[PDB]
Amino acid sequence: QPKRYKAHLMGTTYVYDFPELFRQASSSQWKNFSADVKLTDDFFISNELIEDENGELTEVEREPGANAIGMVAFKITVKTPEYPRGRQFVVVANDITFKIGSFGPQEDEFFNKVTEYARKRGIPRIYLAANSGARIGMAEEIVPLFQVAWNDAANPDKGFQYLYLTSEGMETLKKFDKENSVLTERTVINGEERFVIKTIIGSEDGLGVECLRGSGLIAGATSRAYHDIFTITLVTCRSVGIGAYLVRLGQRAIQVEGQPIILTGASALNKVLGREVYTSNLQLGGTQIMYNNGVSHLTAVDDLAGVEKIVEWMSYVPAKRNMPVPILETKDTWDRPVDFTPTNDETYDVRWMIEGRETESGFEYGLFDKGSFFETLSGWAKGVVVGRARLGGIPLGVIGVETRTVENLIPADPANPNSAETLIQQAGQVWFPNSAFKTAQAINDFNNGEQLPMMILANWRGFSGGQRDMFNEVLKYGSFIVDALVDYKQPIIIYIPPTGELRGGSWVVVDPTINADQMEMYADVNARAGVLEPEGTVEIKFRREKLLDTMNRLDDKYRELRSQLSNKSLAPEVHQQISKQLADRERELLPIYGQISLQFADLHDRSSRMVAKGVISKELEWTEARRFFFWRLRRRLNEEYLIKRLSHQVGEASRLEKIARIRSWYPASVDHEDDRQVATWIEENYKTLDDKLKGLKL
Amino acid sequence: LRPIATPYPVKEWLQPKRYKAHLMGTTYVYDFPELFRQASSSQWKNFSADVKLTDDFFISNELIEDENGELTEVEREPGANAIGMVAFKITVKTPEYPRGRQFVVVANDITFKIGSFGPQEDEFFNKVTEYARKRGIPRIYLAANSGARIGMAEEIVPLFQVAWNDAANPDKGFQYLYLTSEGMETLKKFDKENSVLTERTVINGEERFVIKTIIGSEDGLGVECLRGSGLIAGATSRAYHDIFTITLVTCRSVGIGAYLVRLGQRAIQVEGQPIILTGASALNKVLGREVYTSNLQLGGTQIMYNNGVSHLTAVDDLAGVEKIVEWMSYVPAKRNMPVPILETKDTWDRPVDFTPTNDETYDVRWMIEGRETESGFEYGLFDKGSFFETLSGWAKGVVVGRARLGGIPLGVIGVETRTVENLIPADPANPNSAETLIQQAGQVWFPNSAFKTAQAINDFNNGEQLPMMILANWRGFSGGQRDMFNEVLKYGSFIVDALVDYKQPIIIYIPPTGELRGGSWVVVDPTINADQMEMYADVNARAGVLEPEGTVEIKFRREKLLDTMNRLDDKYRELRSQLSNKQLADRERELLPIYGQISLQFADLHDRSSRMVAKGVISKELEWTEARRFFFWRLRRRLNEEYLIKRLSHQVGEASRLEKIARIRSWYPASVDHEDDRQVATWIEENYKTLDDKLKGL
Ligand SMILES: CC(C)n1ncc2c1C(=O)CC1(CCN(C(=O)c3ccc4n[nH]cc4c3)CC1)C2
C-alpha cells in the first residue's frame, strides 16, 4: 500500500498497523510471564471506534484506511497475565498520511469524543502522536479573484492601499455559493464598483482560529483525563504545537528515538532570529532534550519497543478506574528476608535495595519482587529513583534516594554565541529543585490514573539551602511534594531505611500528618532523625558552658584546677597561673569533649526515640521489612476496600468513624494490630462482610 | 528604667519582651494589632479624606485556648503568652466593608524561645488555621521564627559518664556513654526513669547502664517538633484552597517557617528579613569552606522577590501591614461572599483614553491603569489608582495584579511587550561561576512567565475567589533549545490546569495590536473551561495558526505569487502571453518586494476578529475605547448570573449548569433582551429579593 510506505518514509508505523504491534507486545508479555502458555486469537481483539448516526462512538469492523478524518481510534480487549479474563483500553492516533496528521476541527472533535468515551468507562487512553500541529489554510477561492488598489497603477513599487473584488469577482462567489467567503465594503473608483476586502473568511473549514478552538478543547480534555484515567503517549513521529502540548498534558510519555516533540520548527525559529541558529528539529525536541528534562519518562528504539513499554507500564495499573490494583505474584514470594543491606562505609546503588543485586556468589534479593522494578523518568533529576515495583505480587509506586553524586550537562545555547555547556553536580541525599520536582511529579503520576499505593524510602538530609538552589526556587518544588501528598488517595508508607535519615527540612514534607487518611511512617533500627545533624545540635545546645561543666565532672585535672580557684587567700599571680592552667586544660579537652557531645546528640536521633514520641508507627529491621510490609500493605488494601464499600452505603461519615465501624465487625479475638490475621479474616469473609454492608443499612 | 524622664511610660521597660523584639529588628507581636489599626485608618484617609473614624471602627481580640483546648477571645496584658505562637481576631470597618470584616492574624513570638516551633506552637497554629477555615475568614501569618525547636535531655547532661579507652589519655577515645547506679537512682527519684534506654553491663566489678537511646522527659526536643512541622505544612496547603492566606516575613523565617511562607503562597517580605532553609554558617561548615557571608545572601529579597516566592517587598513592618490590608481590599469578607464592590470617582461610563498603536512602543500598565501625560491623565481600561501589581520582582514578561472595573474587583493578567532582562547571580559555591544577564523577547511565554501566569490564575481563584481578565497578547511559547530544555512545555501545561480549576468568570480579551497564535491560543481557549470562560478580540487584534510570514511561506509560494503577477501586472501578463506561443524573470525581480507585501496582507486579512466571529470562536469583536463600558456590564451581568446559578444549587437536588442558566434566563421578562448585559444585571439586582423569596420553595 502507498499509505503504508508514506508512513514508513516519515519514520513511523501506519496507524492501522499499530493494533498488530499491541498484539505482538501482549503475546511477548505472556511469553515472559509463562513460556508454556498457549495463546489463541481470542486473547487479543482490536475494534475500530467510529461515530454512529447520533455522533456517538461505536465499535466497528471496517476495512482499514477508510478514515475520512486524520484521527483514528481502537478499543482493545486483551487477556494479560494480570487480567487473564481481559482488560480494555482505547488507542487514539493521528494518521500522519491524512493531511500530514494535522489537527483540524474534525480530528479535535473526534479526539475529544474518544477521550470522553475512555473517561466514561474508566479505561486507559493511549495516544500515538504523529502529527504537524493545528491545520493551516487560506481562502483559495479568493486567491484568483482579489484586485490591488495601487497608489499609482503605473508604478506598483509606490505601494497599495487595500485589496478588493470586482462585481464579476462577487458574482463568481455568488454563483459558487461562496458569498460568505469575504467581508466587503462597497466603494466606486473610476466609475467602477470596488468591494474592498475588510476580512477573508473562506468557504473551506480548517484554515485558522477554528483549528485553534479545537486545540484548546483537546488540551482541556487531556488535562481532565489525566486526573481520571491512566493516560500515556507514544511519540511515534514528530509531535508539533498542540501535539507537543498533548504529550505533556497526558503526563506519561514514551519517546521513540529520533522523533521530535516541538513547538516551532528550527527553520521558522531561524527566520525569526534572522540567522542560521538551529540545524534540526531534533536539536529542539529530541530525546537528549525531553528525556533529559523529564517531559519524556522513557525512550524507545522503535515503535514496537514503545508499544512494549506501554503494555509493561499498564501491567501495574488497574483494568479501569477504582478497580483494585492488579496482583501478580511471581516465583519471588513474600516469605523471605531481604538480602542486600546497605552500610554507612560502602557506596551503594539504591536500586540494589529495591530490586536486588546480582553477585559472584549469586543473587542478593532486595525489598521488592525480583525483576519487578520498572524505572521511569530515568533520564531526569537522577538524585531520586522512581518506578513501579511489586511486593509479593502487590503493585506500587516506589521513590528511592540516589546516594551517589549526580551530574547533568546543560547544553550550550545555540542562540547565544557566549554560551558553553555546563556540568552541574548535586550531592546525594539532598533535594534540589529538579529532584524535588521529580518527587512531586512521581507522587502525582502514581496517584492519578495509576491509583497505586506508594512507598517512599525516605533518605534526605534536607533541601539544598545554598544561594543558587534558593534562587532556583527549591521552596516551590518542595511545596509541590506537600500538595501531591495531600491529594493522595491510596495507602502510603514512609520508611526511613537502614543508613537512612530525615532532618528538619526533609521531614516537613513527608510527615504522615500531611495526609493522616493514607500515610504512615516507619524507621529502621539503624535510621536517624532529628531537627539538625549532631554538628548543628551541639552548636545550638551543647555550647562551651556545657562542655566546661562536663570537663569539671569527668576530668580529674580540670576539676582539680577549678577547685584550687575556691581559695580566697591566693596571691594574684598564683591565681593567674592556675586559671591559665584551667584554660590550657580546656583547649586540650575541647576536641574529645566535642566528640562526646556529638555522641550525646546522636543518641537522641534514634528510631527508639521516634517510637517513644509517637511520630512513627513502628521501628523495623530491614531484613524483615519485606515480610512486614507485604502483610501491612495487603491488610491496608483490604481495609481501604471495605471503607469504600461503606462509603457507597449509609451516606456521609468521617474516615475515623468508617474504619472504627469496619474494625468493630472483626471477631473480638482478632488482634487489630496483626496485619496477616486481619487481611486473612477479611479475605475469608468478603461475602459475609458484603451481607453485613447490605444488611446494616436498613 | 532607661530612659529616665520620658513624658509617657517606657513601653520597652514595662514589657522587656518588646525591647527584645526591637533588638531582633522586628515589631513586638502584641504591637502588630496597632499597626493593623494604623493601616486600616490610612485606608479610610486614602478612600475619603473627610471620613471621621471612632475607636469602634477597629477591634483586635487575642485568641487563646480554653480548658477544652477551644479558641476563645480574651483581653489580657501583652507578654502573658505561655507559648511562642499568638493569634488575634480582627474586626475592622473598611471602605469595601463599612459595617465590618473579620480576619485572623497568627504570629510567632520571636521573644519566646527565639520564635521556634515546638509541638504546642504547631498545635495552636493548626487550631487557628482551622478556626479561620471554619468561619471562611482570611488567615494572615506574621513570620518571625527560628524553625523547629531544638533540644536535648537536660536531666542527662549532669549524669552521663564516658567509657574511656584509656582514662589517663582522653584523646585516645571513648567507647560509649553510661549511667552509674546512682545516676539511675537520681532519675528514679525525679520520676524520669523513661528518659533513657539503657543496657546493664559490669566492668571492674561496677554496674554500667550503657546509654542505648536518649529520650528525655521534656517535650520539644526533636522528631515531635518535626511531626508538628508536617501537620502545619499540610494545614497551610489545605487552607490556601479554602480561605485567603497571606504571610508577612517580619523577621527571619527558617525551615518550616520558610515552607509556611511558600505554602500560604501570598507573601510580603520586609527588606533585610531572610527566608532561609539552612543558615550560611552551617552551609559553610558542611562545604568545609567560607562560601557564604550572610543569611540575606541565601534568602533576602534579591533572591525571593526576584524568584516569585515573595510577591511583594516592604521597607518595614507597617509598609508590609499596609500591603496586606490593600491586597485584602479586593478580597471577599469571607469565603463565598460576593467580590467586594468599591466604586471610586472613576466611574464605568467613560471611553478608554490610552490606545496602543502598531508602530509605537507602550507599557501595558498604561492600558490597564492609565498614563499621566503633559496634557493631563489618559485613563486606561480599569479604575484610576486601582491597579495593585503583585509578583512584580519576578518574570516581568507578564504583568499580574488586582484592579477594579467600575468598582468590581478582579485579577488582571497583561503582557509586557518590551524585552525583559533578569540577572542570574554568580553561584558563590562555584569559583567558575559568573553573573548572567538573560533577555527574553516581549509577547513570548518563557518558562518563568508561563509559571507566573499559572501561579496568578491559581492565586486569583483560591481564597481570593476573584473573576479574571487576561489581556491575551502572546505570539506563542519560546520554542528554542534552551527554553525547551528548561521545560517550557511543563509550565505552559500548568496554565491549562489552572484554567480547568477556575471557579469565577473569566474574560480572555485580545486587545488592540494584540495577538494569539497556534501555540498561545491552545492554553487560553474558552473550551478549556466552558463554564467560566469567554473570549473577545479587538477589531485591531490578530489570530491565526502562524504569523503572516509563516502562512505565506507555505500557502503563498513563488508560483502562486507569479500567478498573481500574471493576473495583476500588465507588463508580467504580456511577457507570459508571449512565451505561450530570462526577460519575464526580471519583471519578477522588480515586483517581488511589493507582491510579497500583498501576499502578507492577503494572509493578514484572514487573521481578523471578523473571521473569529464568523467561525464562532469569540463571543464578540470589540472596540478598545468602548471596552470599559462593555466589560463593566458584561462582568456585572455574569457575576449576577453566577450568583443565581449558586442559589439554584440550594434547590431541587442536582441539575446541570446548562439547565440552571436556562431556568434562570427563562425568568427574564419580554422587555429584557438577554443579549443586553446592563438590562439583565439591572433586572436581576431589582428582583434578587423577589427571586430569593420565590425560590424558597419552588
Ligand atoms: C551544601 C548543600 C548542597 N547541602 N549539602 C548537604 C546538606 C545541604 C543543605 O543545604 C542542607 C543540609 C541539611 C542538614 N544539615 C544540618 O542539619 C546541619 C545543620 C547545622 C549544622 N552545623 N554544622 C553542621 C550542620 C549540619 C546540613 C545542611 C544538608
Ligand SMILES: CC(C)n1ncc2c1C(=O)CC1(CCN(C(=O)c3ccc4n[nH]cc4c3)CC1)C2
Ligand atoms: C525565538 C523565540 C524566543 N521567539 N521569538 C518570537 C517567537 C518565538 C518563538 O519561539 C515562537 C514564535 C511563535 C509565532 N511565530 C510564528 O507563527 C511564525 C511561524 C513560522 C514563521 N516563518 N517565518 C516567520 C514565522 C513566524 C514565530 C515563532 C514567536
